């Protein structure tokens, strides 16, 4: 029922390694029987029910069962369960390629669109046909036989290369040892949480809750250099081999499909359309930020020269890679009076969670309720039920996995577990999402205290959750966040604007000790500090976007040399010799290949919607919030990204709001 919750979450999280492997074989056998039955139908025998409906019914049942098998590798605390989940992901990814390249299915779908009356079917069903045909041509099913076999074998190879690329980074356990003197200027609540060694030193891992605080606060330059070297050499040997094979395969596949480069191949499925649009977008933005980067680098060198003189260190007259985050932090303290370690005292995780849920219950017209004794994959995971405030319709559920642990996904993402699409019996499946982040642990007898950047990450990932829950389509392939890659980051970055509003920050903050709110002056300075270090921070994102474009455009290039090239030309901070940042670039194997520009590309759309609609008539306006849910989130992937922006803005988007928020133009 659309107004109940019991029985609609069919996800089990107590699977053993043997059950994961058994369910994987069963899922492949049962799914292949559906594709085989459709393939056996005569061409003049296919209809809407025996072909389109039969495939749509198995796509939703497959992706839900697939979720229980390929998700434990990211969250489970049992390494054997994670290994069985990764093997299930490898086996199911090759199966996806086998089914996607069935010529008999392609012929019968093409024949169905030609004979069926497209006017008597839902417009989303029309989109299902043309997308399926377009996906078949992007697999070469209109090409001769032997080239299809080459594409298939190379697709299966790239599948295992991408899985092994992220598997190496997720299971890395590299750590360094430092003494108390080598960890100068680090606070005691960080030092007292590290593992002690036999010689009274401390173990520091390369994970985010350890790497960033060292690179931002530790006043020992050699300590930051050793950390930056180890961080940008993770899996350097094995992942360079993978990149040296994956990138030529992507080019070789794009050639056989008729495309010049792999970047052109993936750009056709994005709102940017062409690579020449991405180049002009990145280059024009890089030129606007060039004066800001020069002024910020000059201020950083002055900070480094004075500190080397005060502390008696040697001064090399340059900004090394291990100096960037350290003096960016000083720029925030000196130019904007912002102490992140003091400001986090006003952001205990329970107050931030309460304010986060309350902000979007009121804005989106939703009702959140935490479930007790919830079936979860880890003890620290909580479950919430989402209802429509007016009708009481149970839209979906989401999990909160907030704290880091061994073997857990170390970045910050949102996972779609169940799509909010239609079921074969006519009912609607309850959407399910999971917010997976690694926030600060509760230490020193205090609750978890989040820095402002962690609060902004909390709002970003919750935007993906709201997109997954509010999306309601007919087909699973259009549900959730199955939109253009350069558009999926619009709902997430849109909700980041609420951590830069004074009244919104006042509802998110309460001191962990005495419960007092943040002072008015400090609250004003926090909002005014939104553009601190924005020159170099954005230039580094352009560097990553240019490297991602270059590695998928030019053939026979050294990944480390191309990254060091743009670091010196664009960012002005040289890459450390001996490192290999592209070997750690997980986006190149996590669906963002040739598409990392989409973050900056999406920010133009989110800033335009926030400034032109929310910021003009109240950012908590329920009318504007409901219009944002129905036009941006609810359609999911059933409409083009540009079409949904047109319906919300009643015009075309432009960079005026984007450039104004960046202090440009």
């Amino acid at each position: 029922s659309s107004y109940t919750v019991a029985g609609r979450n069919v996800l089990r999280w107590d699977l053993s390694p043997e059950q994961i492997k058994t369910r994987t074989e069963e899922l492949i056998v049962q799914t292949k029987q559906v594709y085989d039955a459709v393939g056996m139908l005569g061409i003049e025998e296919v209809t809407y029910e025996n072909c389109l409906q039969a495939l749509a019914d198995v796509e939703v049942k497959y992706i839900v069962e697939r979720t229980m098998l390929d998700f434990p590798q990211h969250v489970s605390s049992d390494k054997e369960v994670r290994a069985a989940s990764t093997e299930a992901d490898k086996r199911l990814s090759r199966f996806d390629i086998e089914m996607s390249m069935r010529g008999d299915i392609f012929e019968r779908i093409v024949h169905l669109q030609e004979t069926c009356d497209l006017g008597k079917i839902k417009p989303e069903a029309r989109r299902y046909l043309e997308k399926s045909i377009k996906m078949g041509k992007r697999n070469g099913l209109h090409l001769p036989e032997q080239v299809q076999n080459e594409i298939k074998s190379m697709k299966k190879r790239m599948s295992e290369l991408c899985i092994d690329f992220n598997k190496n980074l997720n299971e890395d356990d590299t750590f360094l040892v430092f003494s108390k003197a080598e960890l100068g200027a680090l606070p005691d609540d960080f030092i007292d949480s590290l593992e002690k060694t036999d010689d009274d030193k401390y173990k520091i891992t390369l994970k985010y809750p350890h790497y960033f605080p060292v690179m931002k606060k530790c006043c020992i330059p050699e300590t930051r250099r050793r950390m930056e070297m180890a961080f940008n050499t993770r899996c350097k040997e094995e992942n360079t081999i993978i990149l040296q094979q994956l990138l030529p395969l992507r080019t070789k596949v794009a050639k056989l499909l008729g495309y010049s480069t792999h970047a052109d191949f993936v750009l056709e499925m994005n709102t940017a359309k062409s690579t020449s649009r991405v180049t002009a977008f990145l280059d024009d933005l890089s030129q606007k930020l060039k004066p800001l980067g020069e002024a910020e680098r000059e201020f950083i060198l002055n900070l480094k020269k004075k500190e080397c003189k005060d502390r008696g260190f040697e001064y090399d007259g340059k900004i090394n890679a291990w100096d960037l985050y350290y003096y960016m932090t000083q720029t925030e303290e000196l130019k904007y009076s912002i102490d992140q370690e003091f400001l986090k005292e006003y952001f205990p995780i329970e107050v931030v969670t309460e304010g986060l849920l309350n902000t979007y219950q009121e804005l989106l017209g939703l009702s959140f309720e935490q479930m007790t004794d919830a079936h979860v994959w880890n003890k620290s995971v909580t479950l919430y039920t989402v209802k429509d405030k007016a009708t009481g319709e149970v839209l979906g559920q989401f999990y909160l996995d907030l704290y880091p642990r061994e073997g857990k996904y170390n970045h910050a993402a949102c996972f779609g577990l169940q799509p909010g699409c239609l079921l074969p019996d006519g009912s609607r499946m309850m959407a399910v999402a999971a917010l997976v982040v690694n926030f600060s642990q509760p230490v020193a007898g205090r609750p978890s205290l989040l820095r402002h950047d962690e609060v902004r990450t909390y709002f970003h990932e919750f935007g993906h959750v709201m997109h997954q829950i509010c999306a309601q389509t007919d087909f699973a392939r259009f549900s959730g966040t199955n939109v253009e890659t350069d558009f999926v980051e619009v709902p997430s970055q849109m909700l980041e604007n609420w951590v830069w509003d004074v009244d919104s920050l006042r509802r998110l903050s309460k001191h962990y000790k005495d419960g007092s709110p943040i002072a008015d002056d400090l609250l004003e300075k926090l909002v005014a500090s939104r553009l601190v270090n924005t020159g170099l921070l954005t230039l580094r994102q352009i560097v990553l976007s240019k490297v991602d474009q270059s590695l998928h455009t030019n053939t026979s290039l050294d990944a480390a040399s191309e990254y060091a090239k743009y670091c010196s030309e664009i960012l002005g901070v040289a890459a450390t010799p001996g490192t290999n940042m592209p070997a750690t670039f997980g986006h190149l194997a996590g669906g963002y290949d040739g598409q990392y520009y989409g973050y900056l590309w999406s920010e133009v759309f989110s800033m335009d919607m926030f400034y032109s609609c929310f910021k003009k008539e109240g950012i908590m306006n329920p009318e504007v919030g409901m219009k944002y849910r129905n036009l941006i989130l609810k359609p999911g992937g059933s409409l083009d990204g540009m079409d949904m922006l047109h319906n919300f803005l009643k015009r075309e988007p432009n960079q005026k709001a984007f450039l104004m928020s960046r202090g440009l133009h």
Partner: peptide, 6 residues
């Protein structure tokens, strides 16, 4: 994965 730039 479905979340956070580098």
């Amino acid at each position: 994965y479905g979340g956070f730039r580098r």
